Enzyme design. Structure first.
Site, PDB file in Angstrom:
ATOM      1  CB  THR A   1       5.219  13.574   8.629  1.00  0.00           C
ATOM      2  OG1 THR A   1       5.306  14.681   9.529  1.00  0.00           O
ATOM      3  CG2 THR A   1       3.844  13.552   7.978  1.00  0.00           C
TER       4      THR A   1
ATOM      5  CG  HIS B   1      -7.854  -4.246   2.328  1.00  0.00           C
ATOM      6  ND1 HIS B   1      -7.349  -2.978   2.162  1.00  0.00           N
ATOM      7  CD2 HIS B   1      -9.001  -4.322   1.609  1.00  0.00           C
ATOM      8  CE1 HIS B   1      -8.181  -2.293   1.392  1.00  0.00           C
ATOM      9  NE2 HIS B   1      -9.204  -3.083   1.041  1.00  0.00           N
TER      10      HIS B   1
HETATM   11 CU   LIG Z   1     -10.578  -2.500  -0.291  1.00  0.00          CU
END
Ligand SMILES: [Cu+2]
Ligand SMILES: [Cu+2]
Ligand SMILES: [Cu+2]
Ligand SMILES: [Cu+2]
Ligand SMILES: [Cu+2]
Ligand SMILES: [Cu+2]
Lengths: 345, 345, 345
Positions: free
Chosen positions: A273, A92
């Site tokens: 969170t 990515h």
């Molecule tokens: Cu991917």
């Protein structure tokens, strides 16, 4: 004709990270990494459930790669002849050819060498993606990791202040889809191929049977708890290649959080969170202020406690009674306390 | 007594967008749009599964409307007498009367004209919302689209730099809930009414049977791939009226992403994967740097590969070997490579 | 030896909030709160389904506590002898000892006093967390609330402008996991203990049977609608201790939204829909511009309309025809309208 210096990186098994610099004065390098695909049966829970896993470098998650902005990353992907399926890799972090997937499809007995320029800062997922239904199946079989691309000046708070970590841990979260028999027992298989049909049926209903850190329920608890000390600034990189997560450090915070995981964006401050969208990596810095056990969970507490997704930190140091103290230890309820006169009775 | 110039807009079917300006020197106008409700059986997957759909303008998603901040949007909503149910429209861009839903309830054979002032910039969902359980059922039957309200100065990076797109595509993502018989086959129905009871049972368990772009699995692949060229800045508007999504451009990034979709907020830079919360539209700019096929997915890869949620881009141009190159094509693993001596063996 | 002034706070039942200042010139105080655990059968839906609930102060959610940055919060947690299980409390606002959980475990007939320093601004979840599988089960049984830690200067827009609310409401969202018999009817139990085994089976599949505001379907509709007036700036605090939500104000917007809920971060502007990650609280300011009914939902519209997650606002004031108007009331479709000549036919 890329005439840059070459630097070989020895990867280490998660949740540890190979040695690297944060800030560097080194110029761009060709950073050489090797990932070896290993298909193997792995244990995934505390009752000994086995799983036909597919991995980079024998771990779930695959190891964290660390480079700097403008480095070139030269990845030798190896698919040993003992494996049964083709594999590839999609970064990515990378630009073009489906993240490199369209340039790395290898059969068992083959290897391939991909180079991608680290033009985008942050933490990123990498995963196998052979095509079609094989994409989710390879990913949820364990074929995913992460790569961190640090600014050459290291991390900053988005407001012109340097942020340095004392310690880094990589938490790879894995959703697993384990078939069950008529009786509700998890089924065992002799090969990934034999598990596929039943596994795709579970995958289709989108509900994992297990959600684990570092490949198994309990992987990062007891003996394998993550160590830290009061005063240490710890970077916690979290990835999920397929499914959302909501990390939380129980008894702590995210001092600086890049929940979308990209260092060109200022972090958020003081989170309880945060949210890792499936298909991404994020990162949280925290400076430990208190000693003791911390549980690090996805804050779907059903996932955390019942499907495997709890890690522990064991933090050494001196307790700070100013931040928190037990004023009165457990004791019988007076009389003469007037519980019974309260509004909600 | 709104004495502004009137401009009629001809809507076009997604993923294309009607002609509009980005930056404009035109003053506020009454922008006239017509949406016609069409209930009809549609094909939703590559095996020919049919579906009792409910649409604006015969498409899933409904078409993208584009206006500028301070325009007035005058929508003629038409419910032809061939339809069987009442319909209305709720614009998340609009202020008052449940987004206009409380002013647009029409029976078959009726039309209604709603005007709303475009006071909020961004991309927004619009959807049918007749009341009660009919709200989710109309929405997940396909009755949702989006509206983009551009700043008059067009887009900017939140840091005082103009952003201009060469090309715009609207990706409407649809969660569908298709009943199955005892044998696991999808059931067919002769009317939306006859499908309702069985469909509500699937809806209740919150797990779609299909997750599609532009109304069907494969809608934006093969022949219907999205075109682009290297160097083009492409705006990708993504909407999901009912359920979360995590868009990802495989082999690309989000250069500038408004994942909450509102242009008064600076975009995030360099994202791998972003998050469209159910009930919203978001948008990502990307400048293509490499030619070839890109897959645009929700990065729940099970949804993407197995439930329908993949689109393709076909990008023309010259490959950039600096950004990425295959250093060594697939070849047998040496000897004399010492895989077997590696750490994780 | 903390020699600060003590201030006792009387908690009120949600969605109301105890009296507090926004901006204050008061220095840090020890703010004293009492929470009393009540296990009891509660009604959760409009068909009268009962539920073995576990609560703080007899409500789902527990009450909102409000303090200021640098206050100390001294919580007396009471577990009356009529209860059957141990309980404790974890404050996501707090530093150390698992949020206080490791210092507050009490058996029925015991109370404990915890102090934590309010060092982090924002809205935070608090929840019971006794250990292991009891953590999700206590939380999804209703044992969760929120605490708001205001800056001493009150709220600001992250761009040096004060934000003041006229009115505050606390929306606690609860995912519930209610077992069903062979016939699909919800099962009733005589104790939380007797419900546990069947409830854990539903919990494991991660799909709630009910998603409710203020403890029950319809809790904040009809008679119990939230009041407001045109021109009022209303703070809407939303919490979800276990599961994600996507709040939306139908016919409105989020003028200023802290979706991660922490006031050290600038809010986003003009949102349609925001995202509360499970295990957190967020907050949205909105200035009402139009009178009438507004529905406040999670924009998974199936959850909103079919599983309980809708609240209403009833807003008094004068309609603004400039923002929105019905130009033409429902009327028969002309002829001579040329629907049939449109593109999508
Ligand atoms: Cu991917
Ligand atoms: Cu693979
Ligand atoms: Cu409708
Ligand atoms: Cu809506
Ligand atoms: Cu409890
Ligand atoms: Cu918690």
């Amino acid at each position: 004709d890329l005439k840059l210096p070459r630097q070989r990186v020895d990867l280490v098994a998660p949740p540890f990270v190979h040695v690297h610099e944060q800030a560097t004065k080194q110029g761009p390098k060709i950073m050489e990494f090797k990932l070896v695909v290993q298909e193997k049966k792995m244990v995934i829970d505390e009752k000994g459930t086995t799983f036909q896993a597919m991995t980079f470098n024998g771990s779930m998650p695959g190891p964290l790669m660390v480079v700097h902005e403008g480095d070139y990353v030269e990845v030798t992907l190896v698919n040993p002849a003992t494996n049964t399926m083709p594999h590839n890799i999609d970064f990515h972090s990378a630009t073009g050819a489906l993240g490199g997937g369209a340039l790395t499809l290898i059969n068992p007995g083959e290897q391939v060498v991909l180079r991608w320029k680290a033009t985008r800062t942050g933490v990123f997922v990498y995963h196998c993606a052979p095509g079609g239904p094989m994409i989710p199946w390879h990913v949820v079989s364990g074929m995913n990791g992460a790569v961190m691309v640090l600014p050459r000046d290291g991390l900053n708070d988005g407001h012109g202040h340097s942020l340095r970590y004392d310690r880094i841990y990589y938490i790879g979260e894995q959703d697993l889809y384990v078939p069950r028999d008529e009786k509700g027992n998890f089924k065992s298989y002799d090969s990934p191929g034999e598990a596929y049909s039943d596994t795709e049926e579970v995958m289709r209903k989108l509900t994992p049977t297990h959600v684990v850190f570092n490949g198994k329920a309990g992987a990062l608890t007891g003996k394998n708890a993550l160590n830290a000390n009061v005063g240490e600034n710890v970077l916690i990189v979290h990835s999920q290649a397929n499914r959302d997560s909501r990390p939380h450090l129980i008894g702590g915070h995210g001092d600086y959080v890049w929940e979308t995981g990209k260092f060109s964006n200022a972090p958020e401050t003081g989170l309880e969170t945060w949210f890792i969208r499936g298909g991404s990596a994020g990162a949280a810095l925290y400076k430990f202020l208190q000693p003791g056990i911390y549980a690090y969970v996805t804050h779907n507490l059903i996932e955390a406690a019942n499907l495997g997704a709890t890690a522990h930190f064991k933090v050494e140091g001196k307790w700070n009674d100013d931040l928190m103290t037990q004023v009165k230890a457990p004791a019988d309820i007076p009389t003469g306390s007037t519980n019974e006169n309260l509004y909600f009775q």
